[PDB]
Amino acid sequence: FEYVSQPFLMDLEGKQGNFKNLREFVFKNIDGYFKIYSKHTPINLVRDLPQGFSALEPLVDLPIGINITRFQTLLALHRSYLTPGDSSSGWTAGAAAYYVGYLQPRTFLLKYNENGTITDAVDCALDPLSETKCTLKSFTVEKGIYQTSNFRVQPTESIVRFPNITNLCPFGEVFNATRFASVYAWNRKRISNCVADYSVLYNSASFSTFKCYGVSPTKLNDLCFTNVYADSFVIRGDEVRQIAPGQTGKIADYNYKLPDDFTGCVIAWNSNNLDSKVGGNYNYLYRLFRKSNLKPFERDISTEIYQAGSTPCNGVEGFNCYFPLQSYGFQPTNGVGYQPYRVVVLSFELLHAPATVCGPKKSTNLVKNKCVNFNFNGLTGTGVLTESNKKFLPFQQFGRDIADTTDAVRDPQTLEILDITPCSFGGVSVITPGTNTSNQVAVLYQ
Amino acid sequence: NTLVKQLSSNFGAISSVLNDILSRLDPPEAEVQIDRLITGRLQSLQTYVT
């Protein structure tokens, strides 16, 4: 980027007397655009800024698209017979002053004149009068009491509480086992009394299919579950596309049907260097025919002759009689849709029992009597914590209110009951005798 | 009492607690659920005002 304007010849004589030129600039760096706004005005003052109001018009919007974090101004010094010395010392500088101010996101109420020139503005956070003016959308307010805004005490700390569990449960066995089961006889595994490690599992082995419903994969390390389940099978590539709730498919897909509202996700990866035999591998078996559909999360091990035709087969395997179970044909040399994939399903459930499986958050100290953030096994919010007098039976975890909101909880570590009472909050009222008479106001917190 | 009770409703979303939705869902999938909750509560407030 380079730009040269038309040539000119500015005056270079050092003027005496008082300052007479004021030059205001606004520099912004937004979305790769360097925006410059400029304004020039004749003045007469020895220091400080004039009190008059003035607007700034856009000049250039240069599209560079780079960082700008530090900046420095350049000054032109004077050399003559009155400044003896070398280049480092033989110099003088004429009188010149400059002011630097920093912007920040604010809301302004601007007034446009008939010609569209901004002649006045109000900063909505300077003082109660300005905020009231912004609320009413006017530069003058009559007398009375006005409801302007609200307030709330900001939190001062954050606390995290997790159960005292140290042993890391092995996800390996359901992932690096020498052999798994068939599609129809899909296996199940329970996981409990664990500290979860979904972090490294996401990207360690360069998985193929990883996609989750009802929970974000990056947020899996922030939630506490109970009795994490695991499924397992190996199946063709194409059916992997319909291993998902609310989706139909073949009878093998009806063997393992997911519920409409399923929390968790499926993890699939490639398998050709262990499930491919030079002579062909046919150990794995799948279903091909059934009477009707199956309920979600249901297993079948029944093996009976399929009897769709109007003839009683009675185990003859004759014409119009088919064995419902068929064996997959897997060879190292086949189509791209013919290599088996190993699939494991993780399912989750919430708010049923004390938490037992969740990730490694270092539990922090407990601070009470001051309303702060908290995290009680995934129960977040804000509020003052204090001792409670309500007696919990040994099997009870927490209590709730009419508004279906938590107001009492049990500390997972020391098994202590605590109350929850959010910070004090309210509206704000401004009492003013009107801008016409005076600019004094009173503030009332209700 | 009815206005306060109206906060304990799904309105079609996965959960009726806004912090729960924010805790376990990324913004692109959380926006639609939050919108459903917002429109339900907006109707519940307009009825009371009327």
């Binding site: 209110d401 009419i402 508004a403 909101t405 959010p422 309210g426 509206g427 209700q446 | 009492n1 206005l3 306060v4 906060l7």
Partner: peptide, 30 residues
């Protein structure tokens, strides 16, 4: 201390004006 006649006291005792706190915590004020 409250300068109300006897009949006014009887009228006040016959009208019955935590439930309130739960309402207060959801932005509802009286």
């Amino acid at each position: 201390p409250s300068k109300r006649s006897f009949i006014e006291d009887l009228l006040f005792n016959k009208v019955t004006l935590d439930l309130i706190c739960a309402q207060k915590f959801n932005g509802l004020t009286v």
